[PDB]
Design a binder for this molecule. Structure first.
Ligand code: 1PV
Ligand code: 1PV
Length: 552
C-alpha cells in the first residue's frame, strides 16, 4: 500500500512566504553570513512529496505479537477520563488555525456558543458515524535552516479545529497517561532534560560491558501502515474508558488516523493519505508506541542482552550488554533487518558505540562540564547551527513560536545558549522594555506561554542549580561552537563575554526579577562570582503536531 496517492493539484500556501533571511539593525551583531540562512516554502513541496511517497510491505512475526500482548496487558491497567468541552477548549492555542465553519481559536477559548455548538455537533457525528473519511488540510511548513554541502519543506496534515477539540475530549487523558504505563522508564517525554541525562548516565553504568546505538527510521510517518494504526487503536481500547470515549476513539481511528483525503489551502483535492498524519493529537503517542513495539521486537530477534530502550516519537536509542565488538555489529544487522521487515528501515545504518558521548539522537549528544565545586556534570547539547540561524530570523521578524526561548530552556546548560542566546535576546528585551511580556514557545511539541523573567526558576527546575555555574567545557564542544560561529559569521565567544557584562549590569540596575536574571543567568560573565543559593505538569507527555497549549 502506497503511503500517499496524488492528483496533481499543488500544495498551496495560505499566507505570504519569505525564503530570504530578513535583515534589520540588530542582524549583523548576531550573524554576518546572511546568504547561508533560509526558510522553506511551498515551492519545494513537490520534492518532499516524492520523498514521502512509497510502498509499504510488512512482515509480522511472533516477537512482534509477544511484545504487543505485553503492551496491551499494561494498557489494561489505565483508566482515562473524557474531557469536557470547556476543558478541551482551554487546551487550544490562541493562534490555532481557525475553523472553516466561521469561528477561530479565540472563539473556542472564550466558549462562544457558535464554537461550542459546532463542537457538540462534530462530537455527535463522531458517535453516530464510524465510516466517513474526515477531511484534512495539507500545508508546507515554513522552517529556517542553514545551507549544507537546501532541504525541501516538511508537510503538516491536520483536520478542522472542531475535530481537534473533539480529539482532546476523547484522547487527551489517554495520550497523557498511557505511554508511561505501557513503556515505563523507556518513555522519553516523562523526563526533564536533567532527569534525562541522569537516566542515560545511570543506564550506561548499569551494564557491565555497555554498548549503545541510535536508530533513525527513514521518513517515519510514511512508514506507519493501516496495521500499525489499528494496533495502536487496540492498545487505547484496553483502557478503562467512558463509552462515548470508546466510540469516539474507534470513529477517529477509522475516519481520521488510518487515512483520508487531502485538501490544499485553496480548497482543492491533493490526493489521499494511508499513513500517519503529522498534525493530529495521537501523532506523538502513536509514533512512540509503534517505534517501541517494533524496536522491542527487533531487540529480541537480534538477541541483544539486557536492553534498555529510550523512545520519544520516532527517535530511538538502545543501551545494552556488549557481546563483543564483532558480535555487536552482527546483531545490529539483524536488528535492522527485523525493523525493515516491520516497515521501518533506517536512514543511515546504525552503529554500535562504546562511549555514551559518541551517540547522537534527536540531534543531541551527551557531554561533560564542571560546576562551581569542580565536580563533573553531564548535560545534553547539539550543533548550534540551526538554533543560531533561527535566532537570526527571529531577531528581524516576530514569529508564532520563539525558538530562541525554547532553546534557552531546553539547552540552558550549553556554552552557546548561555553565552550567545541569553546575551543577545536579553539585550533586545532590555532595549524594548519587554522583560515581563509573555512569549509563546514549544517544549516537546506543546505550546507554552512564558515570561522571560521566569527563566531562572524554570532553568533551575529542569537542569538544577549547576546550569548557572558550568565551566571547563570539553575541547570538542568548544571547537564545534567556535567552528559554527566562523561558518555563520557570528562574532567569537570573547565578544559575547564582553556583551554579557553589559547585559548583566543593566539587568542588576533594574532590581527585582530582572536583577535575579542578571545574577543567575550571567554569573558566568564576571570574575567576582556571586554565591548562587536556590530561588524561592510540564513533562507528562509529548504532543508534537497535537495543537496543545498551556499557560503559567
Ligand atoms: C531517544 N533519544 C532521546 O531521548 C534524547 C537524547 C539522547 C541523546 C544521546 C543518547 F545517547 C541518548 C539519548 O537527547 C535528547 C535531547 C532532547 N532535547 C532536545 C529536543 C529535541 C527535540 C524536541 B522536539 O521534537 O520537540 C525538543 F523539544 C527538544 S532536551 C529538551 O534537551 O532534553 C530530547 C527531547 C525529548 C525530545 C530527547 C533526547
Ligand atoms: C572565568 N571567567 C571568565 O570570564 C572566562 C575567561 C577569561 C579568561 C581570562 C581573562 F583575562 C578574561 C576572561 O575565559 C573563559 C572561558 C570559558 N569557557 C568557554 C569559552 C569562552 C570564551 C572563549 B574564547 O573566545 O577564547 C573560549 F575559547 C571558551 S571554558 C574554557 O569552556 O570554561 C568560560 C566559561 C563560561 C564559564 C569563562 C571564561
Amino acid at each position: 500500500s502506497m503511503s500517499y496517492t496524488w492528483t496533481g493539484a499543488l500544495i498551496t500556501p495560505c499566507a505570504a512566504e519569505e525564503s530570504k533571511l530578513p535583515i534589520n539593525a540588530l542582524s549583523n551583531s548576531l550573524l554576518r553570513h546572511h546568504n547561508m540562512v533560509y526558510a522553506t516554502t511551498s515551492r519545494s513541496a513537490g520534492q518532499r512529496q516524492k520523498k514521502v511517497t512509497f510502498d509499504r510491505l510488512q512482515v509480522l512475526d511472533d516477537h512482534y505479537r509477544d511484545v504487543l500482548k505485553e503492551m496491551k496487558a499494561k494498557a489494561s491497567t489505565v483508566k482515562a477520563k473524557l474531557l469536557s468541552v470547556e476543558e478541551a477548549c482551554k487546551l487550544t492555542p490562541p493562534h490555532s488555525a481557525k475553523s472553516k465553519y466561521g469561528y477561530g481559536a479565540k472563539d473556542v477559548r472564550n466558549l462562544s456558543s457558535r464554537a461550542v455548538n459546532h463542537i457538540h455537533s462534530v462530537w455527535k457525528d463522531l458517535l453516530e458515524d464510524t465510516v466517513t473519511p474526515i477531511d484534512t488540510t495539507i500545508m508546507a511548513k515554513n522552517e529556517v535552516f542553514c545551507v549544507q554541502p537546501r532541504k525541501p519543506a516538511r508537510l503538516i496534515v491536520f483536520p478542522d479545529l472542531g475535530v481537534r477539540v473533539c480529539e482532546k475530549m476523547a484522547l487527551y487523558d489517554v495520550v497523557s497517561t498511557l505511554p508511561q504505563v505501557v513503556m515505563g522508564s523507556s518513555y522519553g517525554f516523562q523526563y526533564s532534560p536533567g532527569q534525562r541525562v541522569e537516566f542515560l548516565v545511570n543506564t550506561w553504568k548499569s551494564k557491565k560491558n555497555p554498548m549503545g546505538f541510535s536508530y533513525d527510521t527513514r521518513c517515519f510517518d510514511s512508514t506507519v501502515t493501516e496495521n500499525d494504526i489499528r494496533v495502536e487503536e487496540s492498545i487505547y481500547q484496553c483502557c478503562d474508558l467512558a463509552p462515548e470515549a470508546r466510540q469516539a476513539i474507534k470513529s477517529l481511528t477509522e475516519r481520521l488516523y488510518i487515512g483520508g483525503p487531502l485538501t490544499n489551502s485553496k480548497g482543492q483535492n491533493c490526493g489521499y493519505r494511508r499513513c500517519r498524519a503529522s498534525g493530529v493529537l495521537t501523532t506523538s503517542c502513536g509514533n512512540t508506541l509503534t517505534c517501541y513495539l517494533k524496536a522491542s521486537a527487533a531487540c529480541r530477534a537480534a538477541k541483544l542482552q539486557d536492553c534498555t530502550m529510550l523512545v520519544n516519537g520516532d527517535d530511538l536509542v538502545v543501551i545494552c550488554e556488549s557481546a563483543g565488538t564483532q558480535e555487536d555489529a552482527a546483531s545490529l544487522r539483524v536488528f535492522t533487518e527485523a525493523m525493515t521487515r516491520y516497515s521501518a528501515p533506517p536512514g543511515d545504518p546504525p552503529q554500535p558505540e562504546y562511549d555514551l558521548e559518541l551517540i547522537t539522537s534527536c540531534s543531541s549528544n551527551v557531554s561533560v562540564a564542571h560546576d562551581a565545586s569542580g565536580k563533573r556534570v553531564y548535560y545534553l547539547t547539539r550543533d548550534p547551527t540551526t538554533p543560531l540561524a533561527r535566532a537570526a530570523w527571529e531577531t528581524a521578524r516576530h514569529t508564532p513560536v520563539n525558538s530562541w526561548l525554547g532553546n534557552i530552556i531546553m539547552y540552558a546548560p550549553t556554552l552557546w545558549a548561555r553565552m550567545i542566546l541569553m546575551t543577545h535576546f536579553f539585550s533586545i528585551l532590555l532595549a524594548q522594555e519587554q522583560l515581563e511580556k509573555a512569549l509563546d514557545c514549544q517544549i516537546y511539541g506543546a505550546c507554552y506561554s512564558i515570561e522571560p523573567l521566569d527563566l531562572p526558576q524554570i532553568i533551575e527546575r529542569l537542569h538544577g542549580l549547576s546550569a548557572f555555574s558550568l565551566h571547563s567545557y570539553s575541547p570538542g564542544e568548544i571547537n564545534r561552537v567556535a567552528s559554527c560561529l566562523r561558518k555563520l559569521g557570528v562574532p567569537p565567544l570573547r565578544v559575547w563575554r564582553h556583551r554579557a557584562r553589559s547585559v548583566r549590569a543593566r539587568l542588576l540596575s533594574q532590581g527585582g526579577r530582572a536583577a535575579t536574571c542578571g545574577k543567575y543567568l550571567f554569573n558566568w560573565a564576571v570574575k567576582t562570582k556571586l554565591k548562587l543559593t536556590p530561588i524561592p505538569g510540564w513533562f507528562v507527555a509529548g504532543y508534537s503536531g497535537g495543537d496543545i497549549y498551556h499557560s503559567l
